[PDB]
């Protein structure tokens, strides 16, 4: 007979009950110890609420002081969607270079879909505090109250921490910049262009400190996608209704080219869409021979079903090297952070009923 | 023969009707239902919770279910209370019948149901985290009150 009290699979690491305090996370100079934080979060360890709130608020204050359109220089590693895949985020930093000597730019979508979203926020916000001038974070369409409540990030914060941590993340997501001008060559956004954004100054005049509205320029920055037949100019309309997203627009190849020529830009770097190879390059511009649009997806094995590779753009020495990497193992979670009792109880009542009605028939 | 004592919500006609059904299931007329006699019904041969229900009905722990254990077990799964149906489900997980759901028995009961749909390491992880989030007094196990605080709002456990 197997022990009814002892853990059956003893060698499986048990998540620690110790919650990191302020002295364990922040040193005497106020710099967060990302190595202590990394090892603790990888063990599914949690922080004290006041410590987690301090990381979120101090990171939000740094983001609030930044402009809507960031001015980022090369070299830099550009990263796509993360979607709460914390253990894949650790491989990303191994693959793209240490943030202590490598410039970083994330295109948003740090939460939802994955079940380690708060760990991604806490670790990236801590790196933002530790490297405020070399690590940069943009806003995605998921860094909002509506999508985090429709998906599992709202529930995740209620399970692992509290709703005060969720509300602090929502105010922190309001401070995230919307775009980045990288090396005066590339426009870096999460989704894409907008019919109401024709110059880079149209981004500078936006009010980003709010929940993303259902329509408008700020909405299109986070939600717009390229046409499904991007490059094969069959739809002359530059912006058409995005029926896949239910909002924003599809933008065509002439739409991107008109923006790149008018603003003297080489390409547009965005994410928002999953790719099997971790990236996708679209039709090159006629004058440059460089892809006019590049999608980056940094979530390998998306939803643990796609079996897709991930990639980051490592731009250095006038070379944009696409760096692919595979997924990493992570502890298991039931969908929507459901416990085993809520999961199995309907099956218990079903099977016990099926047994008893057959023995009493 | 001295009278039989039992605690159930059945009237005399229901007890007699369940007695006739009990004799039919008792293939060897031994006065008790063995696991083999329960498994004689083809509908129970693929039910992964048969052995748990038998162990719950077997109050004296002799391995078989006599008529008293048969009546009282069926009684707890039909004019019953809301707490009685919720405690019967609690007893499904509580293998050692100590009043607390421990980590080992919660894994084994779940392993009976999930089969190979989850690896052992995955099931152990969600068993650990379930107890971590549901344990309120910090003893590493799930009491009945802690069990009700999780599955209280979940409304399906009645027979005829």
């Amino acid at each position: 007979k197997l022990s009814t009290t002892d853990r059956v699979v003893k060698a499986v690491p048990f998540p620690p009950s110790h919650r990191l305090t302020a002295k364990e996370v922040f040193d005497n100079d106020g710099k967060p110890r990302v190595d202590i934080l990394k090892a603790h979060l990888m063990k599914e360890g949690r922080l004290e609420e006041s410590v987690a709130l301090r990381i979120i608020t101090e990171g939000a204050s740094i983001l609030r002081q930044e402009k809507n359109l960031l001015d980022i220089d090369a070299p830099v590693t550009v990263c796509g969607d993360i979607h709460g895949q914390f253990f894949d985020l650790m491989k990303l930093f191994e693959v793209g270079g240490s943030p202590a000597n490598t410039r970083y730019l994330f295109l948003g979508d740090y939460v939802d879909r994955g079940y380690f979203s708060i760990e991604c926020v806490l670790y990236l916000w801590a790196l933002k505090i530790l490297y405020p001038k070399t690590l940069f974070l943009l806003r995605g369409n998921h860094e909002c109250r509506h999508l985090t409540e429709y998906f599992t990030f709202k529930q995740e914060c209620k399970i692992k921490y509290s709703e005060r941590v969720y509300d602090a993340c929502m105010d922190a997501f309001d401070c995230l910049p919307l775009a980045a001008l990288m090396n005066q060559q590339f426009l870096c956004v999460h989704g894409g262009l907008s019919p109401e954004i024709n110059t880079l100054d149209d981004i500078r005049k936006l009010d980003r400190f709010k929940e993303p509205p259902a329509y408008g320029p700020m909405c299109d920055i986070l939600w717009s996608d390229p046409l499904e037949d991007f490059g094969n100019e069959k739809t002359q309309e530059h912006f058409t209704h995005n029926t896949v997203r239910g909002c924003s627009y599809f933008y065509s190849y002439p739409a991107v080219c008109e923006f790149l020529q008018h603003n003297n830009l080489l390409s547009i770097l965005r994410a928002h869409e999953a790719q099997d190879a971790g990236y996708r390059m679209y039709r090159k511009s006629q004058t440059t021979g460089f892809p006019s649009l590049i999608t980056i997806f940094s979530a390998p094995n998306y939803l643990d079903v796609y079996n897709n590779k991930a990639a980051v753009l490592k731009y250095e020495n006038n070379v944009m090297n696409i760096r692919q990497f595979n997924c990493s193992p992570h502890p298991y979670w039931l969908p929507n952070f459901m416990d085993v009792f809520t999961w199995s109880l309907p099956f218990v009542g079903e099977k016990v009923t099926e047994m008893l009605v057959n023995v009493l028939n | 023969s001295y009278p039989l004592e039992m605690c159930s919500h059945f009237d005399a006609d229901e007890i007699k009707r369940l007695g006739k059904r009990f004799k039919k299931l008792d293939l060897d007329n031994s006065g008790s239902l063995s696991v083999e006699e329960f498994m004689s019904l083809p509908e129970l041969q693929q039910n992964p919770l048969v052995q748990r229900v038998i162990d719950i009905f077997d109050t004296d722990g002799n391995g078989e279910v006599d008529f008293k254990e048969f009546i009282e077990g069926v009684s707890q799964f039909s004019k019953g209370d809301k707490e009685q149906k919720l405690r019967f489900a609690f007893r499904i997980y509580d293998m050692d019948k100590d009043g607390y759901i421990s980590n080992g028995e919660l894994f084994q009961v779940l392993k009976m149901m999930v089969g190979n749909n989850l690896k052992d390491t995955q099931l152990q992880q969600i068993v650990d985290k379930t107890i971590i989030n549901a344990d309120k007094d910090g003893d590493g196990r799930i009491s009945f009150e802690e069990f009700c605080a999780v599955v209280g709002g979940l409304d399906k456990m009645v027979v005829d």
């Binding site: 039931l334 | 992964p48 999930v114 749909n117 989850l118």
Partner: peptide, 6 residues
């Protein structure tokens, strides 16, 4: 006959 992952 077996509990499935939702």
């Amino acid at each position: 006959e077996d509990l499935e992952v939702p």
